[PDB]
Write an enzyme that holds these catalytic residues in place. Structure first.
Site, PDB file in Angstrom:
ATOM      1  N   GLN A   1     -98.614 -80.802  -6.241  1.00  0.00           N
ATOM      2  CA  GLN A   1     -99.316 -81.751  -7.114  1.00  0.00           C
ATOM      3  C   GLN A   1    -100.713 -81.266  -7.500  1.00  0.00           C
ATOM      4  O   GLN A   1    -101.355 -81.824  -8.403  1.00  0.00           O
ATOM      5  CB  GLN A   1     -99.440 -83.110  -6.434  1.00  0.00           C
TER       6      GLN A   1
ATOM      7  N   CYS B   1     -99.207 -87.905  -5.863  1.00  0.00           N
ATOM      8  CA  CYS B   1     -98.169 -87.930  -4.814  1.00  0.00           C
ATOM      9  C   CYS B   1     -97.067 -88.946  -5.175  1.00  0.00           C
ATOM     10  O   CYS B   1     -95.865 -88.687  -5.022  1.00  0.00           O
ATOM     11  CB  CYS B   1     -98.780 -88.313  -3.464  1.00  0.00           C
TER      12      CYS B   1
ATOM     13  N   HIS C   1    -101.063 -92.019   0.879  1.00  0.00           N
ATOM     14  CA  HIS C   1    -100.266 -90.902   0.464  1.00  0.00           C
ATOM     15  C   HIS C   1     -98.793 -91.298   0.409  1.00  0.00           C
ATOM     16  O   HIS C   1     -98.366 -92.168   1.164  1.00  0.00           O
ATOM     17  CB  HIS C   1    -100.521 -89.707   1.388  1.00  0.00           C
TER      18      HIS C   1
ATOM     19  N   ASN D   1     -93.002 -83.297   1.307  1.00  0.00           N
ATOM     20  CA  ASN D   1     -94.331 -83.506   0.748  1.00  0.00           C
ATOM     21  C   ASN D   1     -94.408 -82.788  -0.608  1.00  0.00           C
ATOM     22  O   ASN D   1     -93.469 -82.121  -1.009  1.00  0.00           O
ATOM     23  CB  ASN D   1     -95.360 -82.996   1.759  1.00  0.00           C
TER      24      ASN D   1
END
Ligand SMILES: CCCc1cc(-c2cc(C(=O)N(C)C)cc(C(F)(F)F)c2)nc(C=N)n1
Length: 215
Positions: A19, A25, A162, A182
């Protein structure tokens, strides 16, 4: 529901993305979930556009953060989300420029996991596939994760800052975990992944803001 499941081995999960310097996110979490449903429905695995979400989800804050539920709603209302190629990631917010010819998926709603219920999140992952989750990712311990099942006493269930993707769950050397994709690139954590403590009193708030799209 099985005791262990990894949707990566079913081909439901796209490569790990980065990102960059933008708080998107939530867009990457959302597209991961949509990607998994698209593969399950149609049999095709492909990259969907986080930028499409960043620019066009008016209920969210672009590179300043946002919710996945608002993303799923946007896709439904818009009757489409672009492929990555059709609306590529630039890591800064620009005017909304959705391209109907590049539509690669649809959304027909979303469901939420009962708040703080890790058993319900487990069952949701086993029945649906990858599920969008929110966590406290603010600790230095999180940033420098490399191996093992991540647990830190100081993680805060009430500080969700997050958004990631739960692509599975299981147990490693006695320690139950969630398999978390992630969006900080393949050179973060374990090939872009982190195993996060499961059924340890909802560690880092992992089951407080879980949702998936319908398709
Ligand atoms: C400087 C960090 C900026 C930022 C914020 C957020 C973020 C902000 C909020 C929230 O509180 N609202 C009001 C949307 C909520 C969430 C979540 F996942 F819980 F839905 C994430 N995410 C990212 C992801 N990179 N980056």
């Amino acid at each position: 529901a099985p005791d262990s499941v990894d949707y990566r081995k079913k081909g439901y999960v796209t490569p790990v993305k980065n990102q960059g310097q933008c708080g998107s996110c939530w867009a990457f979490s959302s597209v991961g979930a949509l990607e998994g449903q698209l593969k399950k429905k149609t049999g095709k695995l492909l990259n969907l556009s986080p930028q499409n979400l960043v620019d066009c989800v008016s209920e969210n804050d672009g590179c300043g953060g946002g919710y996945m539920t608002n993303a799923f709603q946007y896709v439904q209302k818009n009757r489409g989300i672009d492929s990555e190629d059709a609306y590529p990631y630039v890591g800064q917010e620009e005017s909304c420029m959705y391209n109907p010819t590049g539509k690669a998926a649809k959304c027909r709603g979303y469901r939420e996991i009962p708040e703080g219920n890790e058993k319900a999140l487990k069952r949701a992952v086993a029945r649906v596939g990858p599920v969008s989750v929110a966590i406290d990712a603010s600790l230095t311990s999180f940033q420098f994760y490399s191996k093992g099942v991540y647990y830190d006493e100081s993680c805060n269930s009430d500080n969700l800052n997050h958004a990631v993707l739960a692509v599975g769950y299981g147990i490693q050397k006695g320690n139950k975990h969630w398999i978390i994709k992630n969006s900080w690139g393949e050179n973060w954590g374990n090939k872009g992944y982190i195993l996060m403590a499961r059924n340890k009193n909802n560690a880092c708030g992992i089951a407080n803001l879980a949702s998936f799209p319908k398709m």
